[PDB]
């Protein structure tokens with residue numbers, strides 16, 4: 001029964017055909033279970049470890065590496081010779097990296113937890129029902145409960161299903177529904193039907209929601225829905241149906257893989273076309289097997305050279321490091337890849353209370369009627385000091401301290417504030433500050449009572465724990481609170497029935513003290529109090545009252561106003577029904593207006609500045625608040641969202657106004673709106689949806705399970721540190737301090753992390769371009785391999801990985817927050833930059849291939865065969881050039897490979913320097929700008945020499961320590977790379993402006 005709240009208890013019992021005193025029969029249970037299923041949320045997919053291991057090899061680049069690992073394996077097996085000392089190193093290294101890759105991938109999944117499974121923490125193991133086959137209640141497993149059975153719940157129980165309350169056994173039933181409605185105060189439940197078929201959860205006063213808790217009382221009810229049909233169940237289905245897209249970088253990275261895969265295959269086809277002349281060679285002669293092995297060798301090297309094997313680790317390291325940095329600033333990032341997205345944040349949707357404001361309530365003004373005489377009318381307005389909950393402060397009349405007691409009107413003002421209140425104060429000796437007990441709104445009144453002290457009590461005698469509730473207790477001894485008519489959103493007011501303390505056999509003296517939203521309370525007043533007298537509510541006085549209220553709540557004070565009143569002659573006690581909250585408003589009529597109190601929930605001290613940073617950064621800010629529209633707008637003007645005098649008619653909406661708009665208008669309203677007040681349960685999700693239809697990267701705040709759907713949908717769900725674990729699990733980031741300013745600071749950090757990432761990504765991919773050219777130039781010239789797989793891998797993971805990481809520490813630009821949000825579609829490399837890396841790549845390719853060919857020719861240490869052209873042959877089956885001798889295996893010498901590798905390492909240490917800045921020369925922005933980068937270069941060179949001298953290594957890498965002359969040749973070919981990029985940058989700065 002989805003609509004149970006609007007049905008009477010008799011109608012719910014008739015619908016299921018069950019009796020309240022016996023419960024369902026076993027046949028009913030059978031059929032109901034069959035029809036509705038078990039009361040539980042579905043189980044998450046049983047992803048097996050094997051399925052998880054197979055996914056670690058779905059990426060296109062890891063599959064290419066796997067393929068090359070296979071070819072490598074085959075080659076290191078179809079080879080002939082005693083090179084058994086080392087041959088399967090290459091394939092074992094590739095495979096090892098792939099294995100290490102998979103392990104990590106599985107490791108993360110095992111430690112990852114999803115929000116959906118976090119909801120199941122809200123379903124109790126057991127529940128209690130009454131079923132026909134037994135006289136007494138029986139506790140069964142919650143999953144065995146079904147729609148229709150009679151359930152029993154009591155204080156401490158976790159509600160097992162969505163239940164329509166049939167009968168409240170205790171004097172009252174109080175529920176803690178915080179997780180679903182946000183109401184952090186336990187609310188009173190009743191049994192009468194709630195007429196509105198579309199009432200939001202907060203107004204279903206006769207329902208118990210599954211996952212919620214009984215704070216007080218005992219009750220009997222009938223199960224309306226179970227499983228995915230409960231409120232929490234529907235939240236679980238929305239979440240499950242929400243698909244979160246890949247981050248911008250993840251998308252570019254996947255696109256890069258596809259293209260790389262395309263380029264690699266094409267290069268293989270090029271190496272084939274450039275050697276089609278081989279078909280013109282005689283069928284006899286030459287080893288077709290040694291020619292094939294050659295091509296498969298460049299295929300393996302080509303694959304290894306094209307893939308930036310160390311990039312993922314570099315990215316993850318920069319992210320982990322930045323994330324730890326962000327934590328120091330109260331931003332707990334849960335998804336490393338979300339740092340980027342945070343930097344792209346285009347719109348920030350933020351709840352007001354507790355995030356934009358402190359949620360520390362304080363009464364600042366208040367007024368009572370002074371005189372009423374015909375058309376003449378005057379009010380008595382006061383001010384109060386002290387923004388804390390501490391009874392420290394004083395009342396003021398024109399900033400001149402006065403005594404409240406000197407005005408009876410204030411004595412009654414304070415009596416209403418003390419009695420029509422469920423809160424109190426408590427001095428926390430530990431912290432040393434007066435903490436609140438209850439809601440902020442009412443506690444502000446409790447605090448106001450202590451400051452007013454209308455009975456001039458001697459509080460300067462009590463301690464710090466007795467000063468708390470001193471003046472309140474005095475007023476409590478003067479009136480006996482019989483019962484209280486709880487507050488409810490419909491009438492927006494609350495009242496308490498009271499009778500004098502010292503009173504004999506009398507039936508006169510009772511009073512109802514009322515507190516609530518001004519408009520409704522003032523409309524129910526037929527009288528106005530003046531000191532101790534009373535006169536009839538007239539238009540002059542009414543407009544006067546409503547005008548000040550409008551001014552206080554809509555002007556620059558942005559005060560939350562409450563009208564206080566008292567029904568002088570309340571109905572007789574026997575004539576009131578305390579169970580029908582629908583009658584509470586009628587009981588609060590024919591009232592006597594006493595006064596108005598205006599309180600402030602001040603903006604965080606940093607919010608003003610942060611909002612301005614957003615404006616500079618081109619980030620739109622949208623406030624979501626529970627305030628009425630007028631006050632919401634007022635507050636937006638106050639903190640900077642709206643200009644003090646700017647028109648906002650179509651930039652601020654209440655939930656109601658928004659719903660009345662057609663879909664097209666709602667979408668349009670979202671592209672310009674900055675303020676949403678009194679927002680429905682699904683509006684956050686609809687707002688996110690509309691924002692995304694404009695490609696906005698949206699950050700949205702939330703804290704309870706009811707915010708989970710929207711948090712999951714927003715590109716950046718932001719949960720409160722003080723919120724539910726579910727909201728946190730559904731968010732990309734958690735504000736350890738709930739402060740809006742913490743979000744802005746994270747966006748900036750995001751912009752800075754990414755800028756540095758852009759550099760080391762371009763740095764690493766740049767080197768792969770050069771490596772591919774080298775492998776291509778060598779395979780197109782029929783030259784002996786200059787660089788082999790194992791070497792390339794060491795350079796891409798270690799040698800270049802260190803500088804790359806260091807680049808992640810590049811100082812941020814000073815105008816980081818003065819620039820608009822970076823467009824998601826923004827490529828990392830294109831235009832003139834694409835050409836530059838096209839030039840640098842061609843350079844590196846020729847420099848390495850050259851350096852090796854150099855040793856093979858114009859080098860003393862090696863065959864000085866200049867212009868001999870290694871291209872000519874590599875089989876020595878004919879031996880035409882070498883007219884006389886006994887050697888031909890110097891084509892496999894380590895010296896030449898060591899010259900190429902040394903050149904690669906040296907040009908890369910230089911290109912890392914050219915990476916500090918995209919367009920600035922090393923003359924404007926020196927290398928020492930980033931000490932980590934210099935330090936890394938020193939560490940990488942040391943590692944290079946390491947594999948050149950420590951015997952085990954040079955054999956594994958096929959390297960041989962270089963001569964001082966050979967080294968100098970390395971510097972001669974490498975160092976000039978700086979000049980090349982220096983010139984390319986110069987052209988970008990001086991001839992590419994527009």
Ligand SMILES: C/C=C(/C)C(=O)O[C@H]1C(C)=C2[C@H]([C@@H]1OC(=O)CCCCCCC)[C@@](C)(OC(C)=O)C[C@H](OC(=O)CCC)[C@@]1(O)[C@H]2OC(=O)[C@@]1(C)O
Pocket residue numbers: 252253255256259260261263264267270305306307761765766768769770772773776827828829830833834835837838841
């Ligand atoms: C890794 C090494 C190499 C050599 C590679 O093939 O990279 C290409 C490639 C896949 C792209 C290209 C490379 O293309 C070439 O260099 C042209 C072919 C030259 C081969 C000559 C042999 C006969 C990047 C590397 O070239 C330069 C010169 O910078 C730039 C960029 O990449 C990025 O912006 C990185 C995104 C994370 C991508 O065009 C990219 O494709 C895309 O979709 C992009 C948008 O991504």
Ligand SMILES: Nc1ncnc2c1ncn2[C@@H]1O[C@H](COP(=O)(O)OP(=O)(O)OP(=O)(O)O)[C@@H](O)[C@H]1O
Pocket residue numbers: 441442487489492493494515516517518560561562626627
């Ligand atoms: N305890 C209370 N007793 C009487 N009137 C109250 C009380 N709390 C709030 N009000 C009044 O009723 C109005 C509606 O309050 P309500 O709780 O629904 O909204 P809110 O507190 O401003 O935001 P939220 O929906 O997040 O709680 C308030 O603007 C105020 O005038």
Ligand SMILES: [Mg+2]
Pocket residue numbers: none
């Ligand atoms: Mg409230």
Ligand SMILES: [Mg+2]
Pocket residue numbers: 182702703704707
């Ligand atoms: Mg919430």
Ligand code: NA
Pocket residue numbers: 244710711712713714715716717730731732
């Ligand atoms: Na999200």
